[PDB]
Amino acid sequence: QSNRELVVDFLSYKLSQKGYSWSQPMAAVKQALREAGDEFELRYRRAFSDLTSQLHITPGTAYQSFEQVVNELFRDGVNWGRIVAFFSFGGALCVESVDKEMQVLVSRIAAWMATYLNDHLEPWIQENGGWDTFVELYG
């Protein structure tokens, strides 16, 4: 629970009430990631289902099993498309977990994805100009 998330939401709300739209650059990132993930799963369904078939999460799955599958996804280098697939992969694991009435695994998967991004992907993201570069390239 972030105090900064709470501050930014309250100020944004209070500004919109007076007619002012405080631009949050991460809002554009979130929207582009949603759309790119939708497009990846629909237009490249064979690539998407090939990734989701490699892991099914149970309460006994350790992070290292998720890390090994994702490491194989990035085996030939990081690019923004593989990063989209990584988000779609995690979302498919969460949908599956909820399907199987194991909703607690959603928060676990979300923590694994953040760990992987911060340990494996964040230097590359910084070198390539941060998430704003993703937005500019996707539209």
Partner: peptide, 13 residues
């Protein structure tokens, strides 16, 4: 995108 799609393996926004 076309540039990301071209990094798929041939077997496979």
């Amino acid at each position: 995108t076309p540039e990301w799609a071209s990094t798929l393996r041939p077997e496979c926004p």
